[PDB]
Amino acid sequence: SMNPPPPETSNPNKPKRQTNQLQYLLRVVLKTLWKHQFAWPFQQPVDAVKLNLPDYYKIIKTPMDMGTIKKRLENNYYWNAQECIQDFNTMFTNCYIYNKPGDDIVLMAEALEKLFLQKINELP
Ligand SMILES: CCOc1cc(C2CCN(C)CC2)ccc1Nc1ncc2c(n1)N(Cc1cc(C)cs1)[C@H](CC)C(=O)N2C
């Protein structure tokens, strides 16, 4: 079908804090995943029109990507680190839901998820 609008990334009416955890999530976790060889499918929303996948947004009702997560962190959209961790987990899980066990794109998300969990292990 049409793509939906991307997820909201900025709400100037949401109260804002800096934490060590939110700082680590942007400066370490997002940055490390971004630069990974396997990041590029996850750096922007799924453009299902360009990809010719009419069923993508029939299956995926909670879309998420690292581009949105980067903007959410930069815009202090998250109050609790867990909100950001949940967006990363939504992104990975969306990939496992839409795709099939052993698919190249699933193995890519699995490796990103493993790196995620290694970085989250050291959340301050
Ligand atoms: C046909 C071209 O497709 C893409 C182009 C770009 C460009 C990368 C560089 N930037 C600057 C522009 C977009 C980024 C991503 C894609 N494709 C893409 N994005 C997300 C997903 C995706 N495909 N695919 C398809 C596949 C990918 C691979 C490696 C195997 S199968 C699946 C299904 C939607 C997926 O889950 N994701 C997140």
Side-chain angles (χ1 to χ4, degrees), residues 40-42 44 46 51 53 56 95 98-99 104-105 108:
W40 60 270
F42 306 102
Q44 61 285 304
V46 171
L51 287 177
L53 303 173
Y56 187 82
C95 182
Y98 183 75
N99 303 287
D104 56 351
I105 186 57
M108 293 173 75

Side-chain angles (χ1 to χ4, degrees), residues 61-100:
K61 298 298 197 196
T62 307
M64 191 50 59
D65 67 283
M66 291 204 300
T68 299
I69 290 159
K70 177 171 190 282
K71 288 176 194 155
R72 286 174 165 202
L73 286 167
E74 289 165 350
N75 290 314
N76 303 297
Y77 188 84
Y78 304 123
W79 185 260
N80 299 317
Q82 186 50 45
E83 300 177 273
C84 181
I85 295 156
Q86 169 175 338
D87 283 354
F88 273 107
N89 282 336
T90 296
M91 185 181 72
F92 298 135
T93 288
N94 288 351
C95 182
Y96 311 148
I97 294 173
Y98 183 75
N99 303 287
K100 301 301 173 134

